[PDB]
Design a protein around this ligand. Structure first.
Ligand SMILES: Nc1ncnc2c1ncn2[C@@H]1O[C@H](COP(=O)(O)OP(=O)(O)O)[C@@H](O)[C@H]1O
Ligand SMILES: [Mg+2]
Ligand SMILES: [Zn+2]
Length: 693
RNA sequence: UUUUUUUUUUUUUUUUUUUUUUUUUUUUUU
RNA sequence: AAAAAAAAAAAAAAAAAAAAAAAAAAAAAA
């Protein structure tokens, strides 16, 4: 058992009244202990009064699910049965919910429950009720905006409260809200922030706020504040870094001129001129927009489109390496450019090959240099190591590739290797980011990385925003934000991540925008503190407008059915065909009648698809057309035979007759706007014949 | 030889959150 | 003409979850 603290007991007293309350406590103050104590008290009261009891615990991140469940079980002395429900587990949910008094499950499963009965063909396996659980908990409730799963659970709770489907004597469940910070959002004055906070609380049917009143000293002592030092490094326009930047701008102008001649050959006078600045995101946005127009238009010459797409891809890569050279030393940017260019080489023309070889020779002759930010970070690391031998440093970066580059830079310095200091490349488990080719993000790998950091083998953690919440990150003695800026909640979580004694938070950047964002975040935090103080001072909130306006639940569904009918009427157009072709090159991949879907995977049963595909080796699908290098999808097997799987992001839909190009981002749009493929039959036969020989 | 359960890896699709940049519209001020 | 605020569209980056499928390794049964 764990002894309750004074502020924890004060927070628990507010929720002990049975009303819906939201608890706002700093990270690491023991929200899990408070939740477990509230659950235990509610269960004891229900047992004393002689009625059924049930508790539901929900967390946005599955990484912290096991730790939270273990802590809850330990606090409850393992007297009540607990079961963890995740996507991997195939155990039925309703049976374990009925047979156990404490259920911990992903909120999406709760959303699916009591809602899957709708739009289901006739039985319907009865209907589940949200009010089955006596007490529910909403960890990290600040994300309950727009159409979040928490918003869906709130809508189900409103269904149960308003509509008269209560079975026998079912009572309204009590929900406790726990979050680090409510979230300013985009409001400016205190009144708007207070109104937004009150509306968010009303969306969860919460009227009372659990805020510490007289135990602030204990909270400050147990959770000391961490100053947020701001450090800025000036940029150097001269030296090897300046020479590298000049060479890359020369490459910018050369590629722009080549694009100009390519457009002139097409006799096209509409394309937008590139921005003068080659380092801002405006150049990348313009490149992406030009690529979108090129995909959405038709060209007289087939090779011109391929050349333009190759130029746009090289421009994007060169912008990425410009950002890398701005953030770090030119060595990593040169290495990234070299590996990307050597990967894309077998699909290039002779002139571009010579241009790249000349530019690479010039960059090799440039030399090397060191960035002031890297030197400052290294000096801070050695200073922390001198202060204590158990120093732990966590570094936040923008992208996963940025994390890998930072880890390589830190591991390449002999000054840290003299004392035996290593680093890692901690990232997130998400695989849908368009940059997952170099990212593994395995669950076991992440657990192993956490274990080695906890054991002390790894000192520097180049971790992304994933580690801010839902991760069992141990105490860190130094938090560094390497050109990374996020919202107020993420900044607060980063500041609170330094649970080690005398933790220091220092921000290192070379851009005025980062400093402005940090100042804005500090101002937002101060405004939140002022609003919280004002709310505490005045107990008469007198806020009920959103609570009464929340009666619009059924009009929402009414308009939902109306515009669903309108979308169905719009979709009624059919019996037409599509000439699906490759995005980069005008090659007939297949026709609209050769695409089939088994469950949710879209496979093309084209006998001639093998002749126009490369079939590399992992397994991947690549265009066989020269100078294309486009990944049309992934190769998968269902009947022990590999079959092609097209991707919407690598194909362009063409309509027969008029030359109207169609761009598709997700398969849902083409599914519900253009056509629907038929169900799969024993069509792997004709595909397997032509797969071999 | 087949079936059931557990673990690891991989793939497709769908539903959300946060940050930055670009563009458009409206209002206010100089 | 310039600046600020609000809404909308596009692009980039990061994070979360769900559904299904495939491969491999173990335990049990036929
Ligand atoms: N009353 C208490 N007695 C002992 N340990 C506590 C107490 N309250 C909190 N802790 C410890 O402090 C930590 C606080 O982190 P926790 O509340 O679990 O996650 P979060 O970061 O969401 O607040 C817990 O891991 C817990 O072990
Ligand atoms: Mg928590
Ligand atoms: Zn192609």
């Amino acid at each position: 058992q764990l002894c309750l603290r004074n502020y924890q007991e004060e927070l628990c007293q507010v929720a002990l009244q049975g009303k819906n309350t939201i608890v706002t406590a700093p990270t690491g103050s023991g929200k899990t202990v408070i939740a477990a104590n509230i659950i235990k008290e509610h269960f004891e009261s229900r047992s004393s009064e002689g009625k059924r009891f049930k508790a539901l615990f929900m967390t946005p991140n599955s990484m912290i699910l096991n730790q939270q469940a273990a802590s809850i079980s330990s606090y409850l002395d393992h007297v009540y049965h607990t079961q963890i429900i995740q996507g991997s587990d195939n155990v039925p949910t309703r049976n374990v919910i009925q047979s156990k008094d404490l259920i911990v499950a992903t909120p999406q499963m709760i959303v699916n429950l009591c809602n899957e009965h709708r739009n289901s063909l006739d039985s319907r396996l009865d209907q589940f009720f949200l009010s089955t659980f006596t007490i529910i908990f909403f960890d990290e409730c600040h994300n309950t905006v727009k159409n979040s799963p928490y918003s869906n659970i709130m809508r189900e709770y409103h269904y149960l409260k308003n509509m008269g489907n209560m079975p026998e004597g079912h009572s309204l469940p009590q929900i406790i809200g726990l979050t680090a910070s409510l979230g300013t959002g985009d409001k400016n004055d205190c009144l708007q922030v207070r109104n937004y906070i009150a509306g968010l609380c009303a969306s969860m049917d919460v009227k009372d706020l659990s805020i510490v009143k007289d135990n602030l000293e204990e909270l400050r002592g147990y959770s000391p504040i961490v100053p947020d030092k701001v450090l800025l490094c000036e940029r150097s326009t001269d030296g090897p870094i300046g020479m590298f930047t000049n060479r890359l701008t020369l490459m910018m102008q050369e590629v722009e001129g080549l694009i100009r001649t390519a457009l002139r050959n097409e006799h096209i006078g509409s394309f937008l001129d590139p921005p003068a600045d080659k380092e801002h995101a405006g150049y990348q946005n313009w490149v992406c927009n030009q690529m979108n127009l090129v995909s959405g238009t038709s060209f007289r010459e087939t090779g011109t489109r391929t050349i333009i797409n190759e130029a746009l891809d090289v421009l994007k890569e060169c912008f990425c390496t410009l950002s890398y050279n701005i953030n770090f030393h030119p060595e990593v940017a040169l290495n990234y450019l070299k590996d990307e260019m050597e990967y894309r080489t077998p699909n290039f023309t002779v002139n571009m090959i010579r241009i790249w070889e000349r530019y690479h020779n010039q960059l090799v002759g440039t030399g090397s240099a060191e960035n002031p930010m890297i030197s400052k970070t290294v000096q801070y690391i050695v200073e922390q190591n001198l202060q204590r031998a158990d120093s732990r440093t966590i570094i936040f970066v923008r992208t996963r590739y940025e994390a890998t580059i930072l880890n390589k830079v830190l591991n390449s310095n002999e000054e840290l290797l003299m004392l035996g200091i290593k680093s890692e490349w901690m990232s997130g488990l998400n695989k849908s980011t368009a940059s997952s080719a170099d990212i593994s993000a395995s669950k076991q790998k992440q657990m192993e990385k956490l274990k080695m950091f906890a054991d002390g083998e790894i000192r520097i953690l180049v971790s992304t925003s994933v580690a801010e919440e839902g991760l069992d990150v141990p105490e860190c003695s130094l938090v560094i934000k390497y050109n990374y800026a996020t919202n107020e909640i993420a900044h607060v979580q980063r500041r609170g991540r330094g649970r080690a004694l005398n933790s220091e938070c220092v921000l290192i950047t070379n851009s005025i925008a980062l400093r402005d964002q940090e100042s804005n975040n500090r101002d937002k935090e101060s405004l939140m503190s002022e609003t919280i103080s004002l709310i505490q001072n005045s107990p008469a909130e007198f806020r009920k407008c959103v609570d009464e306006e929340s009666n619009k639940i059924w009009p929402r569904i009414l308009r939902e059915d109306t515009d669903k009918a309108q979308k169905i009427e719009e979709q009624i157009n059919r019996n037409i065909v599509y000439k699906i072709i490759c995005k980069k090159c005008e090659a007939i991949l297949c026709t609209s009648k050769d695409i089939r879907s088994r469950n949710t995977q879209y496979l093309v049963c084209d006998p001639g698809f093998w002749s126009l595909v490369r079939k590399t080796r992992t397994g991947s699908i690549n265009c066989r057309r020269e100078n294309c290098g486009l990944k049309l999808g992934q190769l998968i097997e269902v009947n022990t035979v590999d079959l092609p799987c097209l991707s919407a992001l690598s194909i362009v839909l063409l309509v027969e007759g008029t030359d109207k190009r169609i761009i598709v981002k997700k398969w849902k749009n083409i599914l519900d706007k253009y056509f629907t493929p038929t169900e799969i039959r024993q069509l792997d036969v004709q595909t397997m014949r032509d797969a071999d020989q």
